[PDB]
Write a structure and sequence with these properties.
The structure is a homodimer of 222-residue chains. The first copy, chain A, is mainly alpha-helical and 222 residues long. Chain A is 62% helix and 3% strand. Bound molecules: chloride ion (4 copies). Chains A, B: One of its GO terms (molecular function) is identical protein binding.
Chain lengths: 222, 222
């Protein structure tokens, strides 16, 4: 119910955006994900990075238009609506999850911890988390509470909708080139093909810029 | 907008539900729908009927569990969550519609009126509206404001999710037999094959009870 409270407040785009990004931190994945755990965790991580990349490109913390409750500029009004919609998406996912916990038995309520990931997925996950931590202006934000995604549909919906919403966000601002360069910089630290191939597969359908940067880099060996 | 403010209140399942049903009333469809206008309108109508049928079956206005702000029975808690989620869905739809109006040309913003409907579609639409109007508790609710669906995906989202949520609603309550008898009563005034054919097509995928009730009628005269 926290995302709902945030949307009910008087934040500008920047405050709403920073709450969107922080929403990703304490989502857990149910044991149901099985062997798809790593890719699904990374698709969540990628959706987050995508959001962080836009904020960076648009200089969210330095553009005064993003700091008012009532923006005038159409692009910024669009951005505000989109970022509110992302929060509503997390709110609704938390509701679905709550309905599941109400009816399920203890066996179906087991979740993965970060240590459960394969070593390569684990390492990409750390790299993707740290990358947005650098970008994210430091937390005034109150801590959020942990909750779990228990089925694939729920995760797909977040990851797919966030990605579409960032597409809309990028469309509204003159940041086409900046975002592609940023995607290139994000990936300069991963050298081995194994990690690049896992990244490109998880980025499929949700981050064309990361997918292109990874596909181009795998040729710097093959 | 309004749906968010409704969810932010202190209503019980009954108040929230009645607001869900009232949300359908002032949805407009943009001229984009073309030949598909009639069917898409009826699919919205059917999702509304679907919702009203559950309320009638469960005696939404008479069962006092549906009046508490903090219900105790798990099934009623489930119902409250779903009904809140339907309101959130309408609120996102309105946000998407506002983003469209902010950027669209004047010609892109023309909407159908009910009188633009072809005769058999028109008649079926009056019928479905009349049916839920007499089911619905006399409105003390404040009047909501008109807004438009400008593309098919926005409409499909509402129709598919509401149908899916009424499924979850029906599972939470011992009302299997009741909803079937109710679906039969809805269709026994419409007699012509041409109307039942168009009705059944529109009900496909979203209301199986109505689909069968229309199927037994067309088979009775063929
Ligand atoms: Cl702010
Ligand atoms: Cl502004
Ligand atoms: Cl879930
Ligand atoms: Cl109530």
């Amino acid at each position: 119910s926290e995302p709902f409270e945030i949307v009910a407040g008087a934040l500008g785009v920047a405050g709403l955006f920073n709450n969107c990004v922080a929403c990703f931190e304490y989502v857990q994945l149910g044991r149901h994900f099985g062997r798809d755990y790593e890719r699904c965790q990374l698709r969540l991580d990628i959706a987050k990075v995508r959001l962080s990349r836009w904020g960076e490109a648009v200089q969210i913390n330095d553009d005064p238009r993003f700091h008012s409750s009532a923006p005038i500029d159409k692009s910024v009004q669009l951005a505000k609506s989109i970022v509110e919609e992302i929060l509503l998406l997390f709110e609704s996912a938390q509701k679905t999850s709550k309905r599941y916990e109400l009816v399920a038995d203890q066996q179906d309520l087991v979740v993965f911890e970060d240590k459960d990931m394969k070593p390569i997925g684990r390492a990409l996950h750390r790299r993707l988390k740290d990358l947005v931590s650098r970008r994210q202006k430091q937390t005034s934000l109150a801590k959020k509470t942990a909750w779990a995604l228990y089925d694939g549909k729920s995760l797909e919906k977040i990851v797919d909708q966030v990605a579409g919403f960032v597409d809309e966000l990028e469309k509204a601002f003159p940041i086409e080139a900046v975002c592609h360069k940023l995607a290139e910089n994000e990936i300069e630290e991963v050298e081995d093909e194994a990690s690049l191939t896992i990244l490109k597969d998880a980025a499929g359908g949700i981050d064309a810029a990361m997918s292109d940067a990874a596909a181009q880099k795998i040729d710097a060996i093959v």
